Amino acid sequence: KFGTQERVNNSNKKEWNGMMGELLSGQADMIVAPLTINNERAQYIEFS
Amino acid sequence: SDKFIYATVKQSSVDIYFRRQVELSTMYRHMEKHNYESAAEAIQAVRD
Amino acid sequence: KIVNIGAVLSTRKHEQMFREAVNQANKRHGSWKIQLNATSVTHKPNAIQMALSVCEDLISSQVYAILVSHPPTPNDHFTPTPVSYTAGFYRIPVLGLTTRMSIYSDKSIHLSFLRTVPPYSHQSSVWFEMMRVYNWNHIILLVSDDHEGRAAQKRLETLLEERESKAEKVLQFDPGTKNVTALLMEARELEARVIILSASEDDAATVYRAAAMLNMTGSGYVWLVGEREISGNALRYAPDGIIGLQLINGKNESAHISDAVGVVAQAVHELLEKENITDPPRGCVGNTNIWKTGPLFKRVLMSSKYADGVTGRVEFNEDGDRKFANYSIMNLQNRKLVQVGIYNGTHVIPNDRKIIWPGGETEKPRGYQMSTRLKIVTIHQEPFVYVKPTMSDGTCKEEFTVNGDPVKKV
Amino acid sequence: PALNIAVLLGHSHDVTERELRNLWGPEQATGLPLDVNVVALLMNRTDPKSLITHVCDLMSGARIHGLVFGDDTDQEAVAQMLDFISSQTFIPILGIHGGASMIMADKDPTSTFFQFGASIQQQATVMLKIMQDYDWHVFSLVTTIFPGYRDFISFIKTTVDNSFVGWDMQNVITLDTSFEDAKTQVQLKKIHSSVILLYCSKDEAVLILSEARSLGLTGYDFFWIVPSLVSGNTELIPKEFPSGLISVSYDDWDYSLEARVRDGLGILTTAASSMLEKFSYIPEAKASCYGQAEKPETPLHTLHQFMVNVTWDGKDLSFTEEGYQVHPRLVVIVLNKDREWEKVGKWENQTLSLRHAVWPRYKSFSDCEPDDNHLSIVTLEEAPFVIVEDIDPLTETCVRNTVPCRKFVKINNSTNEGMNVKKCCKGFCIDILKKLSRTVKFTYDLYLVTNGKHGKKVNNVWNGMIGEVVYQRAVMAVGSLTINEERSEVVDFSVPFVETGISVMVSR
Amino acid sequence: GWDMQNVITLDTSFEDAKTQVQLKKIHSSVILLYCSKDEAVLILSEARS
Ligand SMILES: *[C@@H]1O[C@H](CO)[C@@H](O[C@@H]2O[C@H](CO)[C@@H](O)[C@H](O)[C@H]2NC(C)=O)[C@H](O)[C@H]1NC(C)=O
Ligand SMILES: *[C@@H]1O[C@H](CO)[C@@H](O[C@@H]2O[C@H](CO)[C@@H](O)[C@H](O)[C@H]2NC(C)=O)[C@H](O)[C@H]1NC(C)=O
Ligand SMILES: *[C@@H]1O[C@H](CO)[C@@H](O[C@@H]2O[C@H](CO)[C@@H](O)[C@H](O)[C@H]2NC(C)=O)[C@H](O)[C@H]1NC(C)=O
Ligand SMILES: *[C@@H]1O[C@H](CO)[C@@H](O[C@@H]2O[C@H](CO)[C@@H](O)[C@H](O)[C@H]2NC(C)=O)[C@H](O)[C@H]1NC(C)=O
Ligand SMILES: *[C@@H]1O[C@H](CO)[C@@H](O[C@@H]2O[C@H](CO)[C@@H](O)[C@H](O)[C@H]2NC(C)=O)[C@H](O)[C@H]1NC(C)=O
Ligand SMILES: *[C@@H]1O[C@H](CO)[C@@H](O[C@@H]2O[C@H](CO)[C@@H](O)[C@H](O)[C@H]2NC(C)=O)[C@H](O)[C@H]1NC(C)=O
Ligand SMILES: *[C@@H]1O[C@H](CO)[C@@H](O[C@@H]2O[C@H](CO)[C@@H](O)[C@H](O)[C@H]2NC(C)=O)[C@H](O)[C@H]1NC(C)=O
Ligand SMILES: *[C@@H]1O[C@H](CO)[C@@H](O[C@@H]2O[C@H](CO)[C@@H](O)[C@H](O)[C@H]2NC(C)=O)[C@H](O)[C@H]1NC(C)=O
Ligand SMILES: *[C@@H]1O[C@H](CO)[C@@H](O)[C@H](O)[C@H]1NC(C)=O
Ligand SMILES: *[C@@H]1O[C@H](CO)[C@@H](O)[C@H](O)[C@H]1NC(C)=O
Ligand SMILES: *[C@@H]1O[C@H](CO)[C@@H](O)[C@H](O)[C@H]1NC(C)=O
Ligand SMILES: *[C@@H]1O[C@H](CO)[C@@H](O)[C@H](O)[C@H]1NC(C)=O
Ligand SMILES: *[C@@H]1O[C@H](CO)[C@@H](O)[C@H](O)[C@H]1NC(C)=O
């Protein structure tokens, strides 16, 4: 999965998956992939 | 329509873009059930 | 006319000196209008014994405020908790002498509990001041899962909010855990090199031992800890170069007793000038009604500033805790602790002593070490990132483009 | 194995000891491996010395393995005292009513003390659910220096950060003191028409609401949400409390004290049954409070970890680590025009059900300006113009370019009553209505019609849009309403915006 | 092509419930005021607050 803010059914918490989940959780530090920039993704991470 | 089915990769940038658009919601409810796991599977499906 | 003040003290000589201080305060203010009668009781091993004795002796004596201190026994497991409940039943204000536990800082549990010493939670403020002096931005928190760790973490985060900065990670461990290696392994891969620890003595000793066995005490690492981490067994295993805090008169009893009795006498004198003053209830049994002017006495105490206090300018904040105390930043050198400066209410001033950072170097270490091993994540996209299985040799076969240049593979 | 439970009540309640003993006589094998011998006791009042002596006597004599405490007064301190007793006796103590039902922030880690109440976090969650259901996304936060405000603000910020609803939080105001003196009017004057979450004490709420009314912050479009702290005693209500003051509290009307005691006894019995199934035998209680026993006093097995998974006959009365009920019986009440607390909605099983689907306008005071810009609009579902669709499964609220609309749907034709389901209405006419609202600056409560169909005069009585408009049940009828001679005679019409005649549809 | 948002009359006192929501109704960047100096001071003070 590329990454999308999805509502987990339990406790109703927003969570990012894919590269977003890897990067935001500290498992990854930089994403070199065909990642499309948009308003939602720029709120939490920074794009060059 | 049922005969014409168009889809995209589940949990990707285009899904977010279609979900946010105000006039584009009507097709989104149709495409959310037909989303594929990755681009390769969609390419294979459209090939055959 | 006579105003009674109750005291629960550790030793008989402490009670005698408290009575002498009461007499001195009465002489200073003047006994012509009101005479301060002081009653005292020694601690007991059982908490239920305290709960019974406070009603049988202090409440039945119609006291206005109760001064509570820790017992001579080194045990410090919430000893003043019973009194703070019983006098909290009638909203009778309680002045804490040397109780640094921050569970009493929450007025929702303890309705009326004042203290002349700041709790362990306020120590974070001191560290924040260091943030402004040595220019440290990325830090690692090692708070515990009890109320103290949570309170310290919350206070530190609140103080960092105004700077629009946050700690890199907030590691949490259960109290009294023999193994903590996982947290230090997780912290090692992080870039922040400033470690802030606040726990019990045993947990601090365990963390220090783990860090010593995990190469966390080398050059480039700085440790900031509270008093509990540099007192007792935690001092034995403390790594060299650790910076700890100690209050000037934290363990002192006489100075705190004198200052507390002075401030309570001033508050009583100020309060009795008001109208329709209500006497405290007499005896726990047969009287379930709260004190009518008890909250008013609480605000009077919280709004009273002692002029010349021995421990310092006695002042209480909105949380009912001591404000603007003298903190002595005290550093471990050659398995010995020496003062490297003094911290006043708001700012940090150093001294002629030279700070020895962990690892033996004297130069001030940088806040973080730049990590040059970037963890790269990639998604399988055919036009951009071809992925191919490898052979048994660990690498896949090299190819060439139409121009003959080799293709680079990772 | 015989399990002894002591149940302490006060003389204020009419329940007698014999009734308390007969409460645990259902005789359907409530405890499969053990039998329960309930002992009851009544006390005058609550005070430290007598309470401690009574608890120690009950532990020493009756050898109770648990304790159910029911308080009659409103003294919060008793609750803390109870916790302390647990920390010194290891006997599970349950708070039932009164002061013992008041929730505390942090319990002692070694104290096995639980309460029948709702924490501040649950109250904030219920407030957020109320605001989301009525689509009051824009709101402010007014707090004081009262204890328990920092964690409340932190939880509110965490919830607003992690919710898909917009939740346009304007600002946070913390009035430390000098409410009427200075430094506070400037902060209170910058709040516009929105919902106010007020957190303080009752006597403090007195002054806060008085100053808010003095500043004109209590209009029809201002909704005040407050926790149980300022609600306090339901019997007494301050005169300055504005009508429409929505509050959340632990219910005291439907949930009687008898049910409270029965639920507490059932919780203790099921915890004992689970422990007997898992462990070997119920440990004997401590010999006495006094004597200074030389021991860690730490039991090998306790009931603290067995109360997390509790399931009584019909309800799920499980508890959390901090001791809060997982599914508290929370009720949302309002101060109606009669100056009395009236129950409106309920919150159980993480499901919030409200009696009023649409929030009725409440006259805050006798001198309040009359409602003029708020309108009730009828609208009928027409495929090109008005599309009605269910609530969005993702956001649990109406999506963009749609407006809320309550449809009066019955359970079936058999029953003569129904409920208003809040669906989302969109389309051409909905967009026109939104544009009219954006131009004329008026608010609307659009609701579907269920009486007629586009209007027809039968028995000299109009139904549908014409009937609703003529009978003063609505101010306008936005939809696919065709202009007609009789309709224009009965009610006034606006300028047509689309040419709609009659035509014939034929198969090609 | 002016943009006249509204006309507000402060008939009653300047510190009661009225004249506050009316003042809050102002969203334009320019305000045309007309009164005498004594109540002008009060109106400007309320607007500043
Ligand atoms: C003034 O203080 C003295 C000293 O504590 C009080 O005398 C004690 O009173 C209690 C309660 O009756 C007794 O249990 C103690 O034995 C007394 N101490 C001595 C040394 O006799 C006295 O009661 C106080 N007076 C008032 C009016 O509060
Ligand atoms: C605490 O737990 C950790 C993790 O389980 C232990 O770390 C292991 O240490 C051994 C050698 O001492 C290594 O071979 C393992 O690879 C380590 N585990 C991991 C996951 O890396 C640690 O030994 C434990 N502490 C004690 C005192 O036993
Ligand atoms: C901690 O650091 C010390 C010294 O930097 C390490 O000790 C050396 O480790 C290397 C690699 O294992 C050995 O080749 C040397 O012989 C060791 N020297 C001595 C004097 O012991 C130690 O291995 C490090 N420990 C960890 C867990 O990283
Ligand atoms: C607690 O602090 C007080 C005040 O500093 C100490 O009392 C002083 O003791 C010295 C030496 O005996 C005297 O010269 C001072 O005059 C005393 N001051 C006062 C105000 O009495 C006391 O010794 C300290 N206690 C401990 C245990 O260190
Ligand atoms: C330690 O605390 C004492 C309080 O006893 C401080 O002494 C006061 O310092 C201020 C500032 O110069 C003076 O105005 C007061 O007259 C001093 N005495 C008292 C009784 O307040 C002392 O400065 C503190 N040490 C520091 C800040 O390093
Ligand atoms: C704590 O110490 C700092 C450093 O000495 C004090 O800050 C100085 O205060 C003096 C007196 O007003 C000023 O002239 C200096 O300009 C201040 N310097 C700085 C860097 O702030 C501070 O006042 C002390 N606080 C207390 C409560 O004594
Ligand atoms: C809570 O208790 C219930 C009832 O005892 C447990 O439900 C049973 O769990 C066992 C073991 O997992 C299953 O074999 C049964 O089939 C379950 N019964 C039913 C009706 O579902 C439940 O697992 C317990 N939960 C926890 C977390 O302990
Ligand atoms: C308690 O709440 C849960 C969660 O809402 C309920 O489980 C739902 O039950 C309905 C009715 O059958 C289903 O349509 C949902 O799919 C269920 N959701 C989940 C997550 O399980 C449960 O029924 C409630 N228990 C009651 C009301 O007794
Ligand atoms: C609910 O969430 C859990 C955790 O992500 C997941 O394993 C499960 O499949 C989800 N179930 C549904 C119905 O979404
Ligand atoms: C008691 O005194 C206070 C302080 O002056 C005053 O506000 C209050 O009204 C008085 N109450 C009575 C009953 O006289
Ligand atoms: C309190 O209860 C006791 C019984 O234990 C009774 O003797 C006494 O009269 C009661 N007090 C009052 C004021 O009724
Ligand atoms: C619905 O109920 C009414 C009476 O309430 C009845 O006249 C009508 O025939 C019913 N419609 C059905 C059964 O379709
Ligand atoms: C429920 O509604 C259906 C459809 O209108 C009807 O056929 C049925 O009789 C109703 N059930 C009753 C009236 O009990």
Curated annotation (Swiss-Prot), chain A:
List of residues binding glycine: P34, T36, R41
Glycosylation sites: N9
Post-translational modification: NMDA is probably regulated by C-terminal phosphorylation of an isoform of NR1 by PKC. Its phosphorylated state is influenced by the formation of the NMDAR-PPP2CB complex and the NMDAR channel activity.
Cell location: Cell membrane; Postsynaptic cell membrane; Synaptic cell membrane; Postsynaptic density membrane
Tissue expression remark: Detected throughout the brain, in brain cortex, cerebellum, thalamus and olfactory bulb.
Domain notes: A hydrophobic region that gives rise to the prediction of a transmembrane span does not cross the membrane, but is part of a discontinuously helical region that dips into the membrane and is probably part of the pore and of the selectivity filter. The extracellular N-terminal domain (ATD) is a site of allosteric regulation to modulate overall receptor function.
Family note: Belongs to the glutamate-gated ion channel (TC 1.A.10.1) family. NR1/GRIN1 subfamily.
Subunit details: Heterotetramer; the NMDAR subunits are modular and harbor tiered domains that function in concert to regulate opening and closing of the cation-selective ion channel pore. Forms heterotetrameric channels composed of two GluN1/zeta subunits (GRIN1), and two identical GluN2/epsilon subunits (GRIN2A, GRIN2B, GRIN2C or GRIN2D) or GluN3 subunits (GRIN3A or GRIN3B) (in vitro). Can also form heterotetrameric channels that contain at least two GluN1 subunits and at least two different GluN2 subunits (or a combination of one GluN2 and one GluN3 subunits) (in vitro).
Protein name: Glutamate receptor ionotropic, NMDA 1
Organism per entry: Rattus norvegicus
Gene this chain is encoded by: Grin1
Positions spanned in the full protein: 483 to 530 of 938
UniProtKB/Swiss-Prot annotation, chain C:
PTM annotation: NMDA is probably regulated by C-terminal phosphorylation of an isoform of NR1 by PKC. Its phosphorylated state is influenced by the formation of the NMDAR-PPP2CB complex and the NMDAR channel activity.
Stretches in topological domain Extracellular: 1-410
Highest taxon in the source lineage: Eukaryota
Positions annotated with a glycan in the UniProt record: N37, N179, N215, N252, N276, N326, N344
Disulfide bonds: C55-C284
Expressing tissues: Detected throughout the brain, in brain cortex, cerebellum, thalamus and olfactory bulb.
Localisation: Cell membrane; Postsynaptic cell membrane; Synaptic cell membrane; Postsynaptic density membrane
Subunit and interaction comment: Heterotetramer; the NMDAR subunits are modular and harbor tiered domains that function in concert to regulate opening and closing of the cation-selective ion channel pore. Forms heterotetrameric channels composed of two GluN1/zeta subunits (GRIN1), and two identical GluN2/epsilon subunits (GRIN2A, GRIN2B, GRIN2C or GRIN2D) or GluN3 subunits (GRIN3A or GRIN3B) (in vitro). Can also form heterotetrameric channels that contain at least two GluN1 subunits and at least two different GluN2 subunits (or a combination of one GluN2 and one GluN3 subunits) (in vitro).
Function recorded in the entry: Component of N-methyl-D-aspartate (NMDA) receptors (NMDARs) that function as heterotetrameric, ligand-gated cation channels with high calcium permeability and voltage-dependent block by Mg(2+). NMDARs participate in synaptic plasticity for learning and memory formation by contributing to the long-term potentiation (LTP). Channel activation requires binding of the neurotransmitter L-glutamate to the GluN2 subunit, glycine or D-serine binding to the GluN1 subunit, plus membrane depolarization to eliminate channel inhibition by Mg(2+).
Record family assignment: Belongs to the glutamate-gated ion channel (TC 1.A.10.1) family. NR1/GRIN1 subfamily.
Gene symbol of the encoding locus: Grin1
UniProtKB/Swiss-Prot annotation, chain D:
Assembly mode: Heterotetramer. Forms heterotetrameric channels composed of two GluN1/zeta subunits (GRIN1), and two identical GluN2/epsilon subunits (GRIN2A, GRIN2B, GRIN2C or GRIN2D) or GluN3 subunits (GRIN3A or GRIN3B) (in vitro). Can also form heterotetrameric channels that contain at least two GluN1 subunits and at least two different GluN2 subunits (or a combination of one GluN2 and one GluN3 subunits) (in vitro). In vivo, the subunit composition may depend on the expression levels of the different subunits. Found in a complex with GRIN1, GRIN3A and PPP2CB. Found in a complex with GRIN1 and GRIN3B.
Outcome when changing F385A: Decreased sensitivity to glutamate
Tissue-by-tissue expression: Detected in brain cortex, olfactory bulb, hippocampus including the dentate gyrus, striatum, thalamus, superior colliculus, inferior colliculus, midbrain and cerebellum (at protein level). Detected in brain cortex, hypothalamus and cerebellum.
Extracellular side: 1-508
Encoding gene, per UniProt annotation: Grin2a
Stretches assigned to coiled coil: none
Recorded consequence of changing D251 to A/H: Nearly abolishes inhibition by Zn(2+)
Protein name (database record): Glutamate receptor ionotropic, NMDA 2A
Species in which this protein is naturally found: Rattus norvegicus (Rat)
UniProt: Zn(2+) binding residues: H13, H97, E235, D251
Subcellular location: Cell projection, Dendritic spine; Cell membrane; Synapse; Postsynaptic cell membrane
Function in brief: Component of N-methyl-D-aspartate (NMDA) receptors (NMDARs) that function as heterotetrameric, ligand-gated cation channels with high calcium permeability and voltage-dependent block by Mg(2+). NMDARs participate in synaptic plasticity for learning and memory formation by contributing to the slow phase of excitatory postsynaptic current, long-term synaptic potentiation, and learning.
Family of this protein: Belongs to the glutamate-gated ion channel (TC 1.A.10.1) family. NR2A/GRIN2A subfamily.
List of glycosylated residues: N44, N309, N412, N413
Effect upon mutating N233W: Nearly abolishes inhibition by Zn(2+)
Disulphide-bridged cysteine pairs: C56-C289, C398-C424, C405-C425
Binding site for L-glutamate: S480, T482, R487
